[PDB]
Design a protein around this ligand. Structure first.
Ligand code: BCL
Ligand code: BCL
Ligand code: BCL
Ligand code: BCL
Ligand SMILES: CC[C@H]1c2cc3[nH]c4c(c3C)C(=O)[C@H](C(=O)OC)c4c3nc(cc4[nH]c(cc(n2)[C@@H]1C)c(C(C)=O)c4C)[C@@H](C)[C@@H]3CCC(=O)OC/C=C(\C)CCC[C@H](C)CCC[C@H](C)CCCC(C)C
Ligand SMILES: CC[C@H]1c2cc3[nH]c4c(c3C)C(=O)[C@H](C(=O)OC)c4c3nc(cc4[nH]c(cc(n2)[C@@H]1C)c(C(C)=O)c4C)[C@@H](C)[C@@H]3CCC(=O)OC/C=C(\C)CCC[C@H](C)CCC[C@H](C)CCCC(C)C
Ligand SMILES: CC(C)=CCC/C(C)=C/CC/C(C)=C/CC/C(C)=C/CC/C(C)=C/CC/C(C)=C/CC/C(C)=C/CC/C(C)=C/CC1=C(C)C(=O)c2ccccc2C1=O
Ligand SMILES: COC(C)(C)C/C=C/C(C)=C/C=C/C(C)=C/C=C/C(C)=C/C=C/C=C(C)/C=C/C=C(C)/C=C/C=C(C)/C=C/CC(C)(C)OC
Ligand SMILES: COC(C)(C)C/C=C/C(C)=C/C=C/C(C)=C/C=C/C(C)=C/C=C/C=C(C)/C=C/C=C(C)/C=C/C=C(C)/C=C/CC(C)(C)OC
Ligand SMILES: COC(C)(C)C/C=C/C(C)=C/C=C/C(C)=C/C=C/C(C)=C/C=C/C=C(C)/C=C/C=C(C)/C=C/C=C(C)/C=C/CC(C)(C)OC
Ligand SMILES: COC(C)(C)C/C=C/C(C)=C/C=C/C(C)=C/C=C/C(C)=C/C=C\C=C(C)\C=C\C=C(C)\C=C\C=C(C)\C=C\CC(C)(C)OC
Ligand SMILES: [Ca+2]
Ligand SMILES: [Ca+2]
Ligand SMILES: [Ca+2]
Ligand SMILES: [Ca+2]
Ligand SMILES: [Ca+2]
Ligand SMILES: [Ca+2]
Ligand SMILES: [Fe+3]
Lengths: 258, 319, 59, 280, 40, 59, 40, 57, 40, 48, 40, 60, 51, 40
């Protein structure tokens, strides 16, 4: 099989078959793989591989037409995208070098806490009303018979010290699962959506610690336009912030340990 | 120390959502959906209701029949003495017809119930694929399950109708019991060379691996970026976001190339289908084709060659 | 026949599309043929003349 | 180069045990303190092994020694040298390679972590990978130790490593009855079912019927709520998954760590404790 | 669909024609094949 | 006679899918057929003439 | 598609003939191949 | 050549040019192999395979 | 594409010509073999 | 043909031959040192 | 990005003269080997 | 020497950080490789004939 | 020595912490890798001569 | 990149003296080997 040609029969034909259509379908995927995010941006480096083709061996596929739900525009892919900003400076001009988050990184909106600008229209449910809503309109809901109700739990910074508390826990009409918790901060006396995904429950002390951002950062938390519902655009917006905390909230984190 | 989406910490509930209504033909859904805090501490705690059309019943019926055969005949074995039935459970079973009636309808005894029961786990199984494509698109849904289901249902027939009946042998068709069935695969490997040498198996493996690999990655990946609605793929497929942003990027600066919250789900459905595909392949070749894959292999220059610290003799020659 | 009318095809099928897609065949089919043929008929490489240079030349 | 939107995440640092030095990229890969090392082993393996391909069984001359993946394989040392460096030619080399491969998966594994950090994401990925990593140790380390032999592990043969199982597997006759191997197998199956469902469903909602809207969970959460009656949920699938797989592995891991150093009779027998129950 | 009559009609012929070119090409083959190594 | 009627079939079949579709099926069958032909029909390549000449000349 | 009958006609022709270049090139091969060692 | 310059409008010069740069080596490396392999090896099959196996001892 | 027939032919010149630089240096290759170690 | 560097940035194909050399150098010495001759013990000294 | 004969040529000169440089290292390499131990 | 004349210009392309360490990597990988490959067949100088071939003296 | 005189400028491209601790880990193993390879056949001092 | 012509010159020198450094070191030990024990 590595030398060249030896035996000769039937079945050994077929092994060639599948193990051919594979190398075909493999490409199919390749293309289908490229839809979004393509083509690439800079020349910091070239395409690593056997045959360094212009931009990917599989010619970018064609536009795909996504017929969104009722009262919804139409999306396609590929679909040229408008270049974004880079609120950061390259630590080094060397291709592949990192970019430092100018000014306050916590909100500099970069890498550890960067994000795209998803549509500014609250994703709705099946018929019309918007999926993710606070337990306000989500009045037809009820805490899981048993699980200790989070409404009234005092959030606590990753620094430990308190940082506001909670309010409505944004449920969903699609799947009876909590996705967000209203956090009436302490200094802002405002409302900052808490991304359960980042919220660690401590049903023992009514607390809800979030090792993501210091207690103070709850003030710089992207504010919600409307409290009765959140749009995809911001759905990514609130999240991305805390995210940064993972590599910002402390000089320690970001920098290596050894 | 961040809530790693393990078990939905605090849950919540709302009335029983009997899904999107169905057109003119899809009989009424049925069931008074229930909730289970436990089951729900992992997924959608609601239970049911479930549909049941014609094939729905028609298939289910053709289902709990073979069971009521492959189940009966089995109990009979340990002379209707359950106690042992309970003991020799994992051992029991129901064997196929004897090599004589190669294809002929086996008598009510000798491997008969198995051909009977078999065909009823031949239709109901095939009928349930209908209970898919049907209830599938009648949801306005395309067909990709229905598809795969075949790929799998293909292999199942490569272990029956298509090959066992293809070699004239109401025996060459797998038994009907955990252990014995666990033996058939064993027996097979032998009767014909040694499967580790039939590419289409050593192949179908890599897949059963990949799936064991990928749906194992993307399961994590999603989770990793499940905070950023990764789990919401649906929309991410349409309107991207930081999810598919952070994700794919990972694999980008990892294994280099990468893909999309869409693409992946592709390879997924593929590796999977491209599994049972390669399964039934070898299993089809192995039998009416090559008889000893070990010989095949080496005869093609495949099978390796090691030294020899031990060798034997051959009676049939010196004696 | 109709070789005149057959030109219109380009109005339904991209040239570049069926272009490189053929340029492929030759490679995919080309190595495939030589490969399929060698074992099956006249293994021109190691089969016949000249006689092995390995054994005949050395020995 | 960078992705359409990658250009905006390549922050500075985030490294683990140091790495703020080589904290940069190359092509689409982040280096750091682990992309660096892993590489080393890679060639001092991917090629160190080449030496092996060269050498072969007897010697680089033996008609036995070939260059066909199908056959090429580096064989571990004889049980002789128990837990000791064997002569490359006789075993060590094999060990050497294996030596590397260990780190190459320990680096890339960690490197994954640094990344997981940069992209301020979750770490489910590596943690998962580790199991898979481990199952490779408890199948060429944890076992061979409780067998006093390094050469007691397995080979590195494109298909050659197949038999190695064939034997050690039959060493208990019907390996199939191994309690683990049963489950561990079952998983590597269930996984290859759910997967063949999720990855399917999705690719059946986002790209549904002709002239139809990108369906919503309000379908999915019912798709199976009809066929099978109940639906694990959407978030869930991406749980059950890792579960299955990250278990299947860890299982199989057990599966062959106990086969031998924890059980010498033919598995079929193990299944006896059952029978002998003072009841039936 | 996505067409009209004057195109369907016209194209219809163009394709059709070519289809037969094959019935011939393939026929010279099946006939020549039989001519050389007959069968049945 | 049905020939005059047959043209309208295009009115339901998209050109792209069925026009090259057949291109795909025709290509697959030739690969298959040439492949089934050897097994029982006749291994024209190495069956009769010319074959086995290489071995008689190899050494 | 995405091109008028003009450019199409233009490409069609220049190409068509060339595709004959091979039918000719490869035919000198099969032809000369039959010469050295025929088969069938 | 006279008129074949037209083709450079359907195929990118860099893509086709580099694409072929890679194609030969693969088709290249693949040749000396398929030829070297079973075919009349030249490296050490016969002579000067004299010192190869003899010189040693 | 992305250029008119002006620099499309100019490149074609360099391309085509050099393309022969191989068809020739590759023919001297095989020919050099046909003389040293022949085949068939 | 010097005007050819107009379609290729240096780095892209400059290194695409830097490694390609090494991905051949080792290969070459390895296939040669493999079957052809084993300059190591294939002639001198004689096996110990 | 971008390339112009002015800057383009400059580099070719330095590059090309480096290309033979290696080639000269390859002729001396094998040729010298042709002397120590023959091959073929 | 010969190629020395214009090799200073190469540094715009080849970044110091990008390719300075990359070499350090190959070298180290090569080092072991060479000692390794040499030891396997040629002259396993380590334990073959000198200086005192002691392992054989004690084992025996 | 030879390279010693102006080699000092390289520290503007090789941060200490990273090149220092880095070498530590790579060297340590580099040693074990040696003893290991050396101790294999050359002379397994443990069991080889005396006592 | 990440330099200009000047800095490019400055480094090309300092390092160039370092690269050979290894090299010379290489030959003395590659030689010492050849002298003490010959391979071939
Ligand atoms: C003798 C024949 C026996 C038998 C003998 C054995 C033996 C013996 C063993 C198994 C093992 C296993 N068998 Mg069994 N088995 C049999 C029949 C079966 C059947 C069947 C349908 O008939 C099935 C489904 C299974 C299933 C299984 C799995 C549960 C299990 C683990 C596999 C694994 O993924 O390790 C997961 C492994 C890894 C993640 C490590 C590799 C990945 C590494 C970390 C990365 C590699 C990187 C690479 C080098 C870099 C280059 C880049 C390339 C692109 C890759 N067996 C028959 C009856 N089986 C094995 C086991 O239990 O292991 C724990 C085992 O040792
Ligand atoms: C099996 C016993 C005989 C034999 C009997 C036959 C018979 C009988 C037939 C062939 C035919 C063929 N055989 Mg045979 N053949 C034998 C041995 C061989 C050997 C061999 C090495 O021994 C070879 C290499 C071949 C090779 C071939 C092909 C040249 C040819 C067509 C196959 C096909 O179906 O394409 C699949 C088809 C298609 C993809 C579609 C058609 C393509 C056309 C030309 C283009 C349409 C216009 C288009 C829209 C314009 C754009 C251009 C591009 C598509 C972009 N045969 C043995 C000796 N062979 C067939 C033939 O010769 O047809 C002329 C045929 O009927
Ligand atoms: C098998 C019988 C003969 C034999 C017969 C032949 C024949 C016949 C040929 C070779 C050829 C080659 N052989 Mg030989 N060869 C033998 C034994 C050997 C042995 C050996 C150890 O025994 C070795 C190491 C080689 C090695 C080689 C290569 C040097 C060479 C090219 C191969 C190739 O596919 O390039 C593929 C090509 C490429 C990857 C690159 C593309 C080339 C283009 C035209 C140039 C680049 C242009 C670019 C755009 C401009 C920018 C410049 C830079 C690229 C940036 N041969 C035996 C003795 N060999 C070929 C040759 O030498 O051609 C001159 C050839 O035709
Ligand atoms: C096989 C029979 C002979 C033999 C015949 C040959 C022949 C014939 C040749 C070699 C060559 C080499 N052999 Mg030998 N060799 C033998 C035994 C050995 C043994 C051994 C232990 O026995 C060893 C260790 C080596 C090792 C080596 C290498 C030193 C050398 C280059 C290989 C290569 O292709 O790199 C691949 C690639 C590269 C090194 C990179 C290219 C270098 C370029 C020119 C510089 C880059 C410029 C850049 C743009 C500027 C940046 C500067 C810095 C990178 C920052 N040989 C036996 C005795 N060997 C080759 C040689 O010496 O060439 C001069 C060669 O032609
Ligand atoms: C690579 C392909 C993988 C795969 C794919 C796959 N499987 C599939 C599908 C697909 C795409 C489906 O669409 C289908 C499915 O789940 O559809 C909803 C399915 C499926 N895969 C299944 C099983 C299965 N798949 C397996 C494997 C695989 N399937 C492959 C790994 C395996 C193995 C051997 O590992 C199994 C065991 C089923 C869950 C389901 C097909 C169900 C079916 O056809 O059912 C027909 C009807 C019946 C059997 C009737 C049941 C009777 C009653 C409802 C139950 C009463 C109790 C019972 C009788 C117990 C006894 C008690 C007594 C006391 C009465
Ligand atoms: C249940 C866990 C499943 C799993 C998970 C898994 N695999 C993973 C990951 C995860 C989560 C990664 O994150 C990682 C990855 O792809 O990251 C981008 C990976 C990965 N899984 C891989 C392989 C792999 N996984 C397998 C299986 C599985 N992986 C399980 C099914 C298998 C098999 C046989 O079933 C293989 C072959 C790699 C592609 C990649 C890890 C790549 C890596 O770290 O490579 C480091 C080294 C090199 C690139 C160079 C090799 C040089 C060495 C010195 C040689 C080693 C020789 C080897 C030991 C012999 C092999 C020969 C055999 C044929 C005998
Ligand atoms: C003679 C001769 C040729 C000798 C050879 C000599 C040579 C070449 C020597 C050099 C040897 C060396 C150094 C080799 C190493 C080179 C390198 C670095 C190779 C790359 C290594 C590597 C790990 C490659 C990948 C391996 C592969 C292909 C594994 C397949 C597994 C698989 C199916 C993976 C899926 C990959 C994909 C598509 C990932 C993307 C992806 C995933 C997985 C998500 O989950 C996800 C979730 C949400 C949004 C997006 C995504 C997303 O994009
Ligand atoms: C203005 O422009 C307009 C609008 C006019 C558009 C221009 C259009 C143009 C220019 C169109 C050009 C069209 C062309 C060139 C068309 C070419 C068509 C061809 C080549 C068609 C070929 C058709 C082939 C067919 C229909 C084959 C049918 C095969 C069948 C039914 C096979 C059955 C096979 C079986 C059952 C095989 C079983 C396998 C075995 C035998 C192995 O089982 C034992
Ligand atoms: C101001 O201007 C600035 C400074 C910014 C720009 C300055 C730039 C400068 C100064 C650039 C300098 C560039 C230099 C010095 C470049 C040097 C280039 C070199 C040395 C290039 C060497 C090229 C080598 C090539 C292209 C080799 C090609 C080899 C091929 C195709 C080999 C094929 C081998 C095969 C197929 C082997 C097969 C092996 C077997 C036969 C065994 O396979 C089976
Ligand atoms: C508030 O805090 C205030 C300000 C008051 C400060 C108080 C500070 C205090 C209380 C500090 C206390 C510090 C302590 C207790 C420090 C302890 C330090 C220790 C234990 C350091 C040990 C570092 C050990 C070293 C460096 C070991 C090196 C080992 C080597 C190099 C081993 C090499 C092994 C080889 C090569 C093995 C080869 C094995 C074979 C031969 C088998 O390989 C083939
Ligand atoms: C007494 O029972 C009571 C009442 C207590 C109820 C309990 C029942 C129980 C506990 C049942 C348990 C059943 C179990 C554990 C079954 C396990 C089955 C297993 C492990 C099966 C494994 C593999 C089975 C295979 C591969 C079956 C394949 C069957 C095939 C391919 C059937 C094909 C049939 C065809 C093609 C029929 C064609 C129609 C004819 C024959 C007419 O064509 C000529
Ligand atoms: Ca049985
Ligand atoms: Ca011949
Ligand atoms: Ca007949
Ligand atoms: Ca014939
Ligand atoms: Ca020779
Ligand atoms: Ca020598
Ligand atoms: Fe998913």
């Amino acid at each position: 099989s590595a030398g060249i040609t030896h035996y000769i029969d039937a079945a050994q034909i077929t092994i060639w078959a599948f193990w051919l259509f594979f190398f075909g379908l493999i490409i199919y995927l390749r293309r289908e793989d490229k839809r979004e995010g393509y083509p690439l941006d800079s020349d910091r480096t070239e395409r690593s591989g056997g045959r360094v083709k212009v931009v990917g061996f599989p010619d970018l596929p064609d536009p795909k037409t996504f017929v969104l739900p009722h009262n919804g525009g139409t999306v396609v892919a590929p679909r040229v995208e408008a270049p974004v900003a880079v609120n950061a400076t390259p630590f080094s001009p060397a291709p592949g070098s990192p970019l430092v988050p100018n000014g306050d990184p916590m909100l500099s909106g970069f890498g550890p806490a960067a994000s795209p600008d998803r549509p500014k229209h609250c994703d709705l449910t099946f018929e019309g009303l918007p999926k993710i809503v606070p337990m306000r309109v989500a009045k037809e809901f009820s805490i899981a018979e048993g699980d200790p109700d989070p409404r009234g739990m005092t959030v606590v910074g990753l620094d430990g010290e308190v940082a506001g508390t909670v309010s409505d826990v944004w449920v969903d009409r699609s799947e009876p699962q909590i996705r967000y918790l209203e956090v009436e901060v302490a200094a802002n006396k405002k409302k900052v959506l808490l991304p359960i995904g980042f919220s660690r429950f401590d049903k023992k002390a009514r607390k809800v610690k979030v090792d993501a951002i210091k207690a103070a950062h709850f003030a710089n938390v992207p504010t919600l336009s409307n409290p009765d519902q959140v749009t995809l655009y911001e759905e990514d917006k609130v999240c991305a912030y805390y995210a940064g905390g993972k590599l910002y909230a402390t000089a320690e984190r970001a920098g290596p340990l050894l | 120390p961040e809530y790693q989406n393990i078990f939905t910490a605090v849950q919540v509930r709302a009335p029983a959502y009997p899904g999107v209504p169905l057109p003119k033909g899809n009989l009424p859904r049925i069931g008074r959906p229930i909730f289970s805090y436990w089951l729900g501490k992992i997924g959608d705690a609601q239970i049911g209701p479930i549909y049941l059309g014609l094939t729905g019943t028609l298939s289910i019926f053709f289902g709990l029949v073979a069971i009521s055969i492959i189940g009966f005949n089995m109990l009979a074995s340990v002379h209707w003495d359950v106690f042992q039935f309970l003991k020799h459970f994992f051992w029991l079973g129901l064997e196929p017809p004897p090599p004589q009636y190669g294809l002929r309808i086996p008598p009510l005894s000798e491997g008969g119930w198995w051909l009977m029961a078999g065909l009823f786990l031949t239709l109901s199984i095939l009928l349930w694929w209908v209970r898919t494509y049907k209830r599938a698109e009648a949801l306005g849904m395309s067909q990709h399950l229905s598809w795969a289901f075949a790929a799998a249902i293909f292999f199942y027939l490569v272990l029956g109708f298509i090959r066992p009946v293809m070699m004239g042998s109401w025996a060459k068709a797998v038994p009907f019991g955990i252990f014995p069935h666990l033996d058939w695969t064993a027996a097979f490997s032998i009767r014909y060379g040694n499967l580790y040498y039939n590419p289409f198996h050593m192949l179908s493996i890599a897949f059963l691996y990949g799936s064991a690999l990928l749906f194992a990655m993307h399961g994590a990946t999603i989770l990793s970026v499940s905070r950023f609605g990764g789990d919401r793929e649906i929309d991410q497929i349409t309107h991207r976001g930081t999810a598919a942003e952070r994700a794919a990027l990972f694999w980008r600066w990892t294994m280099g190339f990468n893909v999309t919250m869409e693409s992946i789900h592709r390879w997924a459905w593929w590796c999977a289908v491209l599994t049972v595909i390669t399964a039934g392949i070898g299993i089809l070749l192995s039998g009416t084709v090559v008889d000893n894959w070990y010989l095949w292999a080496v005869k093609h220059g495949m099978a390796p060659a090691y030294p020899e610290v031990v060798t034997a003799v051959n009676p049939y020659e010196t004696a | 026949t109709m070789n005149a009318n057959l030109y219109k095809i380009w109005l339904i099928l991209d040239p570049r599309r069926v272009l490189v897609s053929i340029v492929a065949f030759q490679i995919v089919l080309g190595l495939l043929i030589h490969m399929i043929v060698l074992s099956t008929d006249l293994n021109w490489l190691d089969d016949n003349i000249p006689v092995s240079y390995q054994a005949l030349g050395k020995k | 180069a960078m992705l359409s939107f990658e250009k905006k995440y390549r922050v500075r640092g985030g490294t683990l045990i140091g790495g703020d030095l080589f904290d940069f990229w190359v092509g689409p890969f982040y280096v750091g303190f682990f992309g660096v090392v892993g590489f080393c082993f890679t060639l001092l393996g991917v090629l160190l092994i080449v030496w092996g391909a060269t050498i072969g069984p007897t010697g680089p001359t033996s008609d036995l020694q070939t260059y066909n993946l199908w056959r090429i394989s580096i064989a571990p040392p004889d049980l002789s040298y128990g837990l000791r460096m064997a002569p490359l030619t006789e075993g060590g080399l094999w060990q050497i390679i294996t030596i590397c491969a260990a780190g190459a998966f320990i680096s890339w594994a960690l490197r994954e972590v640094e990344i997981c950090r940069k992209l301020g994401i979750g770490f489910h990925v590596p943690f998962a990978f580790s199991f898979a990593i481990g199952a490779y140790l408890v199948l060429v380390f944890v076992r061979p130790l409780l067998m006093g032999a390094w050469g007691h592990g397995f080979p590195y043969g494109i298909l050659s490593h197949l038999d190695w199982v064939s034997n050690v597997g039959y060493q208990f006759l019907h390996f199939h009855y191994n309690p683990a191997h049963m489950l561990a197998i079952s998983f590597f199956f269930t996984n290859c079912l759910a997967l063949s469902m999720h990855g399917s469903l999705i690719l059946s909602v986002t790209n549904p019927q002709k002239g139809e809207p990108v369906k919503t969970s309000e379908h999915e959460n019912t798709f199976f709520r009809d066929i099978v009656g109940y639906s694990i949920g959407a978030l869930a699938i991406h749980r059950l998954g890792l579960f299955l797989a990250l278990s299947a592995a860890f299982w199989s891991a057990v599966c062959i760590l106990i086969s031998g150093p924890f059980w010498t009779r033919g598995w079929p027998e193990w299944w006896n404790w059952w029978l002998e129950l003072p009841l039936w | 669909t996505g067409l009209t009559d004057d195109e369907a009609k016209e194209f219809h012929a163009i394709f059709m024609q070519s289809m037969y070119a094959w019935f011939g090409l393939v026929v010279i083959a099946h006939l020549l094949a039989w001519l050389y190594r007959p069968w049945l």
